Design a protein around this nucleic acid. Structure first.
Ligand SMILES: [Cl-]
Ligand SMILES: [Cl-]
Lengths: 286, 277
DNA sequence: ATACAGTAAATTATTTTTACGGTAT
DNA sequence: ATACCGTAAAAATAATTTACTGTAT
């Protein structure tokens, strides 16, 4: 029942203990502008209400250390949680290389191309299940032209932002890149579409990612370890309309021609799945 | 002079106004566990102490909306700022697809390979400028073997974690994948090497990214708009030891053979720089 | 009718300030 | 003597509770 701010301090305690091996009040002080006394109380609150006696004061290292059986209770055990805490405390989302703390660098992709006036209109249309008229341009049709769309979900792929939307002139659900929308979209009064009919969005498929069959056995074991594969594969369930983005996010080879460079593409989509993958040209708006 | 908690609430007010066009106390209440009265007090504090009169209550849309003259004062106009705020409230870093709120999906890459005990030791060695003995394996030598390293920086490329470190067996600074480090790294008493000698780390270069020249003029203008090019190019200054990771992060073609697929690679490293890498 | 809106006064809870401690090393 | 630690008691600040409000659609 704790407020978000206290929760952030509990998370910070847990992540510092778990990932750095050491926790001192001063770090929480530097992060939250707190007194040593309240930070001490935060540590005690953690150690009694969240992770009972999970931390122990070790005067040898002049700070708190996790107990041998320490197991996080507010975060999952992967390192994204640690980076997320650090970057939320010292954000530099505009920079190419974030340096949230000393000795940590994180490659970023600053997006300055998505305009707020486009976002407010499109997100509101998403929430209202409303229909927009907008000016758009695609690779297939690169001069500005009108589109009539009923959007339902904004999507960040890890590289680009688009909105999943019903295209009324083609009568299909497609992806529209938000950076390609000129001016501000305007609401139009036409019968709206039910997003439940977006087959590709609601149907799932399982992609099987495997080590590049061109690598020798010791090399494939390294790929398995790199991606945490349980049994020589990554089975990835994903919405059909998001499969390609997921594959791109993993840097997977999806054509037999790509997989021939096992150095560039140690991770490959298993061949039987390739003929399953929908056409990518019809993902993008026409 | 405002507390960190208050600053986060001010940030949330600004970002909701700027990116959603509308702000109501109820959202702040759901986000921070506040009473409507305190959230109302936060809105007034923003509108008077941070961005004077930038917001106005519009009863027609049942909330506060930014004024036509609205200008953010606590955030940059990068949509990353909005997504980071949203995701900071609902931590689902484990999911393939995060849904920090309804009508928003975010493709993620959950990392399952980087171990905490490896991080504690290596981070401590970075801060102490100390020297570690560890068990490693690479694609070139995929049998497990010992390596002696002086690390200085952990690196997240957007796809993988590695540590930049002086490699004592090859007397070069190299990148070590953290997923290949066995959980038992050891501090050893060997002179550590000065990270100031990491030539690749401290030298910068300027990469020039351009629309794929195979695209026609109208398509190239779209690439320019997509990537925010001021004058038909993206000039990216970066540490040499991070250049390749940056190019991968942008999904840019870096070989003339890759640049032949203008659909897969609308963005390419300019030819003169390709021979530099 | 709904879902938004203002706030002051009183009560309550959160942090801060102050002081006087203990343990490696 | 550094560098970390506990934490009560008093004081200061922030937040909640209560109780009255108003408006476009
Ligand atoms: Cl650094
Ligand atoms: Cl971009």
């Amino acid at each position: 029942a704790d407020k978000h701010e206290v929760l952030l301090r509990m998370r910070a305690i847990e992540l510092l203990a778990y990932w750095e091996g050491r926790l001192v009040t001063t770090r929480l002080m530097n992060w939250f502008g707190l007194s040593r006394q309240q930070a001490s109380a935060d540590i005690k609150r953690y150690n009694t209400l969240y992770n009972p006696d999970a931390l122990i004061h070790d005067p040898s290292v002049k700070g708190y250390v996790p107990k041998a059986s320490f197991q996080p209770v507010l975060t999952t055990a992967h390192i994204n949680e640690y980076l997320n805490m650090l970057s939320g405390l010292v954000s530099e989302s505009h920079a190419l290389i974030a340096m949230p703390e000393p000795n940590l660098a994180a490659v970023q992709l600053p997006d300055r191309s998505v305009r707020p006036e486009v976002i407010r209109e499109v997100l509101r249309a998403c929430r209202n299940q409303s229909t927009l008229k907008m000016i758009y341009a695609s690779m297939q049709n690169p001069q500005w032209h009108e589109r009539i769309i009923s959007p339902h979900t904004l999507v960040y792929t890890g590289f680009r932002w688009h909105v999943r939307a019903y295209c009324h002139q083609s009568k299909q659900f497609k992806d529209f890149l938000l950076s390609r929308i000129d001016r501000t979209p305007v609401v139009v009064a036409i019968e709206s579409v039910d997003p439940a009919q977006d087959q590709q969005w609601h149907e799932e498929i399982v992609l099987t990612l495997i080590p590049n069959p061109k690598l020798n056995s010791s090399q494939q074991a390294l790929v398995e370890k790199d991606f945490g594969m349980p049994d020589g594969r990554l089975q990835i369930p994903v919405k059909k309309a998001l499969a390609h983005y997921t594959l791109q996010r993993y840097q997977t080879a999806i054509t037999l021609a790509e997989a021939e460079d096992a150095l560039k593409y140690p991770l490959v989509l298993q061949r039987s799945d390739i003929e399953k993958l929908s056409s990518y040209l019809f993902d993008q708006a026409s």
